[PDB]
Amino acid sequence: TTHFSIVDKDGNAVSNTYTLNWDFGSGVVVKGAGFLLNDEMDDFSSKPGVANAFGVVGSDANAIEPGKRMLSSMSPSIVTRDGHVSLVLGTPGGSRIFTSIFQVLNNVYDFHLPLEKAVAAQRVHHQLLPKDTIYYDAYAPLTGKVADELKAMGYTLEDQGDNMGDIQAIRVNGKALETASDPRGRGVGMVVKP
C-alpha cells in the first residue's frame, strides 16, 4: 500500500491511498503489458473466525461474493476547520492504517506536537486478536520502562517485521503550507509556489 496527499493553491485537496495489498501483490505480471496484479482477495474473510494476513477476522459481512468489494482499512483523510482544509493525511499499514492515523491526529490535536514530530513519533497497535498483543516496528520499538510496564500488565509485545505506516501529510496553517514525509519511508514533500 502507499499514500500521497496534495493541496493546490485554491485550497482544494486530494488524499489518495491505493495498493496491490501485499508488496508486489500477487506476484503475477500481465505478460505484454508489464503491470502487477493485486492479491487484494485476502482482505475478504476466507473462513469465519480465521485471521487473514493482517490478523483480522470476519464472517458474513466480509465474506466472498461475486462483484463484492472486500473490506479495507485504507483511510485517506482530510481534516477541515471552518470550511477550509487544515490537514491532509493517510498511510499504508493494513489493519494498522486507521490506528496510525488516530495516533497522528492525537499528536497534532491533543499533544499539540509540530507536524514532523507528530509523524516521526512512535506508533503502536492493538486489534483485539491476537489476544492482548501490541505490535511495534523496528523504527521505534517498545523498550525500557514502558515495555516492562506493558509486559507486566499482561500484554504481549511483538515486532511486526515492517514499519508501522508511511504517513504523508500536509498541514494548512492559515495561508501557509507544511509537509511531512514519514521518516520510516523514502517520501518527499514540496511546497509549490505559483
Binding site: T19, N38, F102, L128, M153
Partner: protein, 336 residues
Amino acid sequence: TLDGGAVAAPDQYGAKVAAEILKKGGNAVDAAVATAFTLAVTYPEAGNIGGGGFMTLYVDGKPYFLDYREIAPKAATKTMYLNEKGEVIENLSLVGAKAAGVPGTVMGLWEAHQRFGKLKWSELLTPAIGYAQTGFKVADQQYQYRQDAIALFNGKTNFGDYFGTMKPGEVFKQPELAKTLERIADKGPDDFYKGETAKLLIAQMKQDGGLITSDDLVDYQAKWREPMRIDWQGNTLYTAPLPSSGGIALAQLIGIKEQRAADFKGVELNSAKYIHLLSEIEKRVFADRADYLGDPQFSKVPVAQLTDPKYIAKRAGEVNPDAISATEKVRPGLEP
C-alpha cells in the same frame, strides 16, 4: 487564498511530478492523477494500475469520496480458498492469479479526473511514461522488499521475468509498461477494461488459472460515495466510508477517546497508560469491525447504530483504564 500548493509523496518521483503539474496550472486532482500513474512505475510494490484504492477530496468547499476498490470476479465463491476438506489453502488468496480482484485504479483515476481535473488527460500520463521508458533508480528498501517478495513467490509466478533485474541504486526501465500507459493516455480506461490491455489481462488469467473475465472488466465501475464525517473540538474529519472500515473505526476511536478525556488528562504520549488506553479502545473497535462491516451494498450494515453518540458513550464506558479487559468478553456492541 493559499501561499501555493503542496505535495507529500512516498518517493521523490511522485513528489516531483505532482509539483510540476501544480506549476503548470493543474489542480490537486490533475496532480493526483499524474502522481498515481508515476508511482505505478516508480513504486511498483504498491503504486499500481493493477490494484485499487480510495480517494478523499475537498473541492470548492465540498467533500467527496471515490471508491475504486477491486471487486470479486463473477466466478468467485465463498469457499474458493478452501480445500475439499474445508481447510484454508496456503497462500491461494495471496500469491498467484486467483488472489486478484478486478482492478479499479485506472477507472478511479479516470472518474476523478473527468469530474474535477482541469488539464488534458493524456498529458497527465507523460511523466509516468517517461519514467517507464528511461527508468528510475531502485531504492535500497524497495529492492529488499523485492528480495522478500521473490522468495515468498517461490517460483510460482512470472514476477522474475519483469522485476528480477532490479538492483539497488541502478536505473530500472519498464518498456512494456510504457506502452500500456501510452494506450491508457490515448484511449482512456477503455484500453484497460475493453481494449488491448484488457485482452492481455484475460490471456494471463487463462495462462495462470485465474478467474477474471472480459465481462468482469467491462462491468467494473468506480463509485462516488458520501465520505465519513467526524466532528470533534470544532474540526471536521472527512475519511473513507464502507467498504473501508477506517471511517467507522475513526468515528469510534475519536468519539470514545473524547468521552474518556478524564482518563487521558495528564498522561504522557506513549506512556504505558496511554498505550493501554488506546488498546482498550481498539479492542471494541475491532470487535465491531469483525462482526458488522463489509461491502455496504451486499448487506444492511448498521452504520448509524455503530456511530450514534449514545453507542459511543456505552462503548466508552467499557474502557478499563487500570487493567486489560477480558478479550473473550469484548463483544460486538449491538449484540442483544
